[PDB]
Amino acid sequence: SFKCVNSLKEDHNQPLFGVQFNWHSKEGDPLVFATVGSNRVTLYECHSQGEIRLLQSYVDADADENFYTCAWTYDSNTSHPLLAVAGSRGIIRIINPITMQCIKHYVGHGNAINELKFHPRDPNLLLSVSKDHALRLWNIQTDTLVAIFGGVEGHRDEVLSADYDLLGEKIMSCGMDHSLKLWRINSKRMMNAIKESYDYNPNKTNRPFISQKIHFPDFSTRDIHRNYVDCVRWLGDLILSKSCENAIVCWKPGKMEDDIDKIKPSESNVTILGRFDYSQCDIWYMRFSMDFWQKMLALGNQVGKLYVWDLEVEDPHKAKCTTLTHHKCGAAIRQTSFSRDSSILIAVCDDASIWRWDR
Amino acid sequence: DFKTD
């Protein structure tokens, strides 16, 4: 299936911590992905014969910025794609990918941002997770902080990853405190807060926009992993998460037959539905990705090996693994990304290299 | 736990 068709290296020689294909490409335009590393974001276009065409970068004013993460959305009025980036400065930048202008930025975390994710039905709802232990939900249409997910019952150390479920009714987050926490955003309070955030125009009122303080997860566990949890993804109602213990665990809150929407905050059980082991991934901040349909899952390890799991099987534990190696690919792979149509997989590395694999 | 090798 996948064959390695090209690679390159970016000129800064620092880790590429993130990669994302733009899944909002217009019909008939070439496939495009963004990489983030050092103080820059760079866009590339995929062409035939494995060509990876360099386009243009956004380079931060601060030489000490270090971007960690990026996420694509689009402008909800014009349809044009937008790219959000963030990293150690704790500043979210919204980038026009065509000109690479910083259209606007958001501050509040003040503290490093480890991940950004956009809501799967509302292109304006951006979630950030921070070294300051909180998540924040932003509305990038009205430029409002809708809610802060924190408090002593929230995360007690850096939050490293988070994912919305299929309809963006709830969020699972995870971090350095070894726990995975659920935060429901379809509550009456949260739905109202979002609606109010769309009604907010500071030119038409005197009040500041009030943010929700959400201090209580809807479920919490520390029973899945025994070290920093660095990546989490919903799979329907189940969860896929990993730590730096050479495993992705597939699990769910509660007991085997418990409905996710009936789980109470005080739920003390989880169910393990399978575990996908692999090797040489004991460093933290190593993220897996899935294709658009959630048929497959790719993870790179710290010596440049790729694992891909076929999840198109009746139960999670029946996943079929294949691996992808190249003799010149030896640096740690921080993240992978599939093109929308699943024909291309990209891996980015700690030595600033980019690896292209075609189906 | 190391972020890097």
Side-chain angles (χ1 to χ4, degrees), chain A residues 228 244 283-284 334, chain B:
Chain A
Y228 296 171
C244 52
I283 54 164
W284 64 271
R334 293 279 172 185
Chain B
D1 190 22
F2 248 26
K3 190 186 183 173
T4 184
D5 20 22

Side-chain angles (χ1 to χ4, degrees), chain A residues 26-259:
Chain A
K26 305 258 171 310
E27 186 186 329
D29 290 348
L31 307 177
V32 165
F33 63 94
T35 63
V36 282
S38 182
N39 62 337
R40 81 177 71 155
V41 207
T42 313
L43 267 47
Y44 299 89
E45 222 166 59
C46 293
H47 287 279
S48 62
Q49 289 82 53
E51 186 195 358
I52 300 174
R53 197 169 298 166
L54 171 69
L55 265 30
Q56 180 189 12
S57 279
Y58 172 83
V59 179
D60 201 78
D62 181 352
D64 296 322
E65 174 59 292
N66 185 3
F67 286 127
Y68 290 170
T69 183
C70 71
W72 294 88
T73 192
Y74 46 91
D75 185 288
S76 75
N77 301 295
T78 72
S79 87
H80 299 324
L82 294 159
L83 178 57
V85 298
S88 58
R89 291 182 69 199
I91 295 167
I92 298 165
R93 294 195 186 272
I94 301 308
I95 308 306
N96 182 337
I98 294 169
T99 58
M100 293 313 269
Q101 290 165 98
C102 184
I103 284 154
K104 66 194 170 174
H105 63 284
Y106 299 103
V107 171
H109 278 311
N111 306 305
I113 295 171
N114 289 138
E115 203 156 57
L116 294 178
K117 286 293 177 71
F118 278 100
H119 190 287
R121 313 265 246 59
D122 180 351
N124 305 131
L125 297 183
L126 171 63
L127 179 72
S128 56
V129 318
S130 176
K131 167 166 180 162
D132 71 9
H133 308 183
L135 296 81
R136 287 156 133 98
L137 175 69
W138 306 84
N139 177 334
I140 74 168
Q141 171 75 302
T142 58
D143 302 323
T144 43
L145 181 59
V146 182
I148 313 190
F149 303 84
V152 277
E153 302 301 317
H155 287 281
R156 281 170 193 238
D157 204 339
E158 310 203 17
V159 195
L160 294 182
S161 182
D163 191 48
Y164 291 96
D165 68 342
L166 180 77
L167 302 191
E169 288 178 349
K170 53 184 168 295
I171 296 165
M172 191 66 82
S173 59
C174 65
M176 287 190 177
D177 59 9
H178 305 198
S179 73
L180 286 123
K181 302 178 177 297
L182 174 68
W183 309 87
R184 298 183 183 274
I185 66 185
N186 62 344
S187 60
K188 266 195 261 150
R189 172 193 189 181
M190 282 302 305
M191 288 178 90
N192 176 244
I194 285 156
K195 171 169 137 290
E196 288 290 341
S197 74
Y198 274 111
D199 288 336
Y200 185 78
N201 181 353
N203 298 126
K204 296 312 275 167
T205 191
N206 305 126
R207 72 207 160 92
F209 184 70
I210 312 304
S211 294
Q212 314 302 124
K213 310 330 173 301
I214 305 294
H215 278 6
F216 304 92
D218 300 281
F219 172 81
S220 192
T221 189
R222 284 180 84 268
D223 284 0
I224 307 301
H225 311 282
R226 299 164 123 260
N227 209 329
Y228 296 171
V229 193
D230 60 352
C231 193
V232 55
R233 185 85 171 75
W234 291 88
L235 185 69
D237 291 341
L238 308 177
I239 305 294
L240 297 167
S241 52
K242 64 177 282 299
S243 172
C244 52
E245 310 171 307
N246 291 315
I248 292 157
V249 174
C250 185
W251 61 278
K252 60 178 274 170
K255 234 85 151 278
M256 171 72 81
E257 61 298 342
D258 291 343
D259 188 331

